[PDB]
DNA sequence: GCACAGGATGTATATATCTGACACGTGCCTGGAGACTAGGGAGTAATCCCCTTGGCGGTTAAAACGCGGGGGACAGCGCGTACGTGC
DNA sequence: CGTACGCGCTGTCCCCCGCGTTTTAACCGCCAAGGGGATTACTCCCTAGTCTCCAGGCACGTGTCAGATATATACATCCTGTGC
């Protein structure tokens, strides 16, 4: 019985991080999963062209970054770059 | 078949649409409109099925079609 | 993991796989699955935020598609982002044009 | 007694914008879908989710459309939507030519 | 003396500008504008003269497309004169913001 | 040297000329400012993006290509300048 | 013949279309018929367009195809016009079309 | 340095189709754009089709169905025929 | 009350001329051709079971249809003025 | 500077909305059957990778004619004038 993946459990964990005493329906869960994949493509895609445009073979956090700045509206971009630059530095801390 | 899209159904959609008053000729116009819509979406959909060598049009063919057409839909395996 | 090592809830592994396999480029940096998983995590938070709010406002403990729609269409910045997305079972915001109202 | 022409209209608008349930009953719609697809390929099957997907996409679209239609009506100092509005809406959307 | 009636030179001018392809905004003003806006995003930027020329090509196309659809909105309203509200309806419908 | 009020370079006869190629013949006086309004939101969009490409390419010069890529991005693809 | 173009009896460089599809991250691997097919479809269209442009050039009494000629070509053809329905041609101009209600009676 | 272009192939085809007819620098440029645009559009949508079908390779079957989504009717039909012809031609030779 | 010459208004057009861009020929190099291997993708065939279709009959809401009159569309008119034209 | 259009008013006629009752088929629940899609193991064709080999394709340079420019002239019409 095939082992189909999703983002479901992580959506949940983040839900708890923001609204601890709140739950979700399957129907809305699909929407959250759709949302994630759509956003993932759009950012990944932009990043991809960015590389090409600049005759370079690698999609780095930087490519991802500027992708985000083209894909997102002023404020939402702003925070996104934060969380982005943060988790990266915090990652490069640990090893 | 097409006329299966009932006047009252079309009326409800326009209500959710914010519309107060509806001309008679609208109903039929709506139908051509809706038809064109499905056609294009189902043409693209089927093309995905034809290419997937399946006799069963999936949700993902639909979903891929709506993307193609810039009418992205969430909640059927994005 | 690496979700840990970056304080993320979002699968930093999963993401690194998907970038390599989804044909975006020849090679794929170490920071990017982290940068992106984060941005993904960030944005799913903002939605879950305002939807939950909306479910409180609409007096329910569980979020249904509507609560997402309300959260989205009412947010000026999110609505743009999902400017071309129809959300299943979203409905519409209530909006009735003036001149249509009684006198 | 009798409610003044247009007052249940306003009341109905309120009711439908508050709800998220689909407004075309499934089976006529479903039969319309199969008909249209048959014209593209014979002996075909649809996933029930594949039909819902179409249904959602279509309604959502039509509602959006009435919204924009309705604005054109209003632009013409009118209060009744008419096919000439839809044509203008779509024209400007760049759907129709 | 002599005096062409109102609307007579408009029709002429339309036909003039619909035969040709040469840019309608003056070259220098245009550039000053673009250099401004860009400064206010990041200072210390230079431009390939062809890069300005691109943005202008893209600019006029848009506005002419725009006026086209504005014009339709004027006509929708049994009017012949275009008005900010017309433009405004075109942009709402195009789904611009 | 400082740059100020340049949108008023977009003179009224030009905003006119465009409207004519646009098939409009009768122009309301309140149109000219709305057009400048629009042209601005337009240029602010293409250049925000053009620039983001220029910043990514780590450059101080904005190229015909950064522009063209931006337009493509905004669904206003343009032929004639590379790409 | 050596040129894969000739093997396919095509004007378009099938070697180029092949390199591009790889240096382009569309998939791991590329078939060998896909370049060919694509290189040909590219040709059909440049031909289909150049045809109508030349005719446009001709009516305008001209030896040389300039973008107005491509523009006239494109927006006069229902179908090409839709393929390029979101595209701008530098120096195109627009189609002469004046609305009815603006014409004198 | 080398700036590649479809300038020769476009000339070739123009000469085949309107032999007493030349193209301007700008016109060429435009043409040159059009080829590239339709290249990506096709190539991209083919790439999606490989992906959607858990498939590692873009074969002309992909490039074909890609074409059936991208192009309008008469254009699509002809292009398809034109295409599958040169493949057939290519196999044999 | 209208229409057609009177006139000068702009566009059309004919001309030659002067220019610079295209179109070509030459030669130099890089990207494709050629030939070979080794490896894994995909195609094919062989089994499975899940999902789709189908057909049937009960209440039950929704579609239909008509009736009657109200208010909105639309057409006519007139006023006031803004926008086109010209210098 | 004034003309002809935006719009505000009116006035009529009918096309929609409301509402009560009469007519259809949407829906739900229940079971039944086989199509097709999903999964598995196998072999071989096809494509990536690698090397050596050379003309297709590029830049570079140069010669000329299509087209832009300048100015003269023929063709079209629109509105103002004058008279019956
Ligand atoms: Cl990285
Ligand atoms: Cl192939």
Swiss-Prot record, chain A:
Main location class: nucleus
Glycosylation sites: 82
Cellular component annotations (GO), alphabetically ordered: nucleosome; nucleus
UniProt entry keywords in alphabetical sequence: Acetylation, Chromosome, DNA-binding, Glycoprotein, Isopeptide bond, Nucleosome core, Nucleus, Phosphoprotein, Ubl conjugation
UniProt keyword Heme present: no
Cross-link Glycyl lysine isopeptide (Lys-Gly) (interchain with G-Cter in ubiquitin) mapped to chain: 90
Location within or outside the cell: Nucleus; Chromosome
Complex and partners: The nucleosome is a histone octamer containing two molecules each of H2A, H2B, H3 and H4 assembled in one H3-H4 heterotetramer and two H2A-H2B heterodimers. The octamer wraps approximately 147 bp of DNA.
Role noted for this protein: Core component of nucleosome. Nucleosomes wrap and compact DNA into chromatin, limiting DNA accessibility to the cellular machineries which require DNA as a template. Histones thereby play a central role in transcription regulation, DNA repair, DNA replication and chromosomal stability. DNA accessibility is regulated via a complex set of post-translational modifications of histones, also called histone code, and nucleosome remodeling.
Family to which this protein belongs: Belongs to the histone H2B family.
Protein name as annotated: Histone H2B 1.1
Lineage, broadest ranks: Eukaryota, Metazoa, Chordata, Craniata, Vertebrata
Swiss-Prot record, chain F:
Residues annotated with N6-(2-hydroxyisobutyryl)lysine modification: 12, 25, 40, 58, 60, 72
Residues with N6,N6,N6-trimethyllysine modification: 1
PTM-bearing positions, type N6-glutaryllysine: 12, 40, 58, 60, 72
Post-translational modification note: Demethylation is performed by JMJD6.
Positions carrying N6,N6-dimethyllysine: 1
Domain of life the protein comes from: Eukaryota
Any one GO CC term of the record: nucleosome
Positions carrying Phosphoserine: 28
Sites of N6-methylated lysine modification: 1
Residues the record lists as N6-propionyllysine modifications: 12, 25, 58, 60, 72
Main location, first listed in the record: nucleus
Record location of the Glycyl lysine isopeptide (Lys-Gly) (interchain with G-Cter in UFM1) cross-link: 12
Biological process according to GO: nucleosome assembly
Positions of post-translational N6-succinyllysine modification: 12, 58, 72
Residues modified as N6-methyllysine: 1
Transmembrane domains' residue ranges: none
Record PTM N6-butyryllysine, positions in chain: 12, 25, 58, 60, 72
Keyword Translocase tagged: no
Residue list for modification N6-acetyllysine: 12, 40, 60, 72
Modified residues (Phosphotyrosine): 32, 69
Residues recorded as bearing N6-lactoyllysine in the entry: 12, 58, 72
Family: Belongs to the histone H4 family.
Protein name as catalogued: Histone H4
Protein's organism: Xenopus laevis (African clawed frog)
Included range, full protein: 21 to 103 of 103
């Amino acid at each position: 019985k095939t082992r189909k993946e999703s983002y479901a459990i992580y959506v949940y964990k983040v839900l708890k991080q923001v609204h601890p005493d709140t739950g979700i329906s399957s129907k809305a869960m699909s929407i959250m999963n759709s949302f994630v994949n759509d956003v993932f493509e759009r950012i990944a895609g932009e990043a991809s062209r960015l590389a090409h445009y600049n005759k370079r073979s690698t999609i780095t956090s930087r490519e991802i970054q500027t992708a985000v700045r083209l894909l997102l509206p002023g404020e939402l971009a702003k925070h996104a770059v934060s969380e982005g630059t943060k988790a990266v530095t915090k990652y490069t801390s640990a090893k | 078949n097409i006329q299966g899209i009932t006047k009252p159904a079309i009326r409800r959609l326009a209500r959710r649409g914010g519309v107060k008053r509806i001309s008679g000729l609208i109903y039929e116009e709506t139908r051509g409109v809706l038809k064109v819509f499905l056609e294009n979406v189902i043409r693209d959909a089927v093309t995905y099925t034809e290419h997937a060598k399946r006799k069963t049009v999936t949700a993902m063919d639909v979903v891929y079609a709506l993307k193609r057409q810039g009418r992205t839909l969430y909640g059927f395996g994005g | 993991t690496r979700s840990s090592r970056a304080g993320l809830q979002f699968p930093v592994g999963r993401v690194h796989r998907l970038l390599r396999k989804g044909n975006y480029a020849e090679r794929v940096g170490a920071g990017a699955p982290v940068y992106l998983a984060a941005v993904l995590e960030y944005l799913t938070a903002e939605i879950l935020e305002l939807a939950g709010n909306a479910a409180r406002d609409n007096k329910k403990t569980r979020i249904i598609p509507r609560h997402l729609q309300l959260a989205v269409r009412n947010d000026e910045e999110l609505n743009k982002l999902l400017g071309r997305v129809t959300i299943a079972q979203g409905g519409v915001l209530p909006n009735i044009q003036s001149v249509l109202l009684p006198k | 007694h009798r409610y003044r022409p247009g007052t249940v209209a306003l009341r109905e608008i309120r009711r439908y914008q508050k709800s998220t349930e689909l407004l075309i009953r499934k089976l006529p719609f479903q039969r319309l879908v199969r008909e249209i697809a048959q014209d593209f390929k014979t002996d075909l099957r649809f996933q029930s989710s594949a039909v819902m997907a179409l249904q959602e996409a279509s309604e959502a679209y039509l509602v959006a459309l009435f919204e924009d239609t309705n604005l054109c009506a209003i632009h013409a100092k009118r209060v009744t939507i008419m096919p000439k509005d839809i044509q203008l809406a779509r024209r400007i959307r760049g759907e129709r030519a």
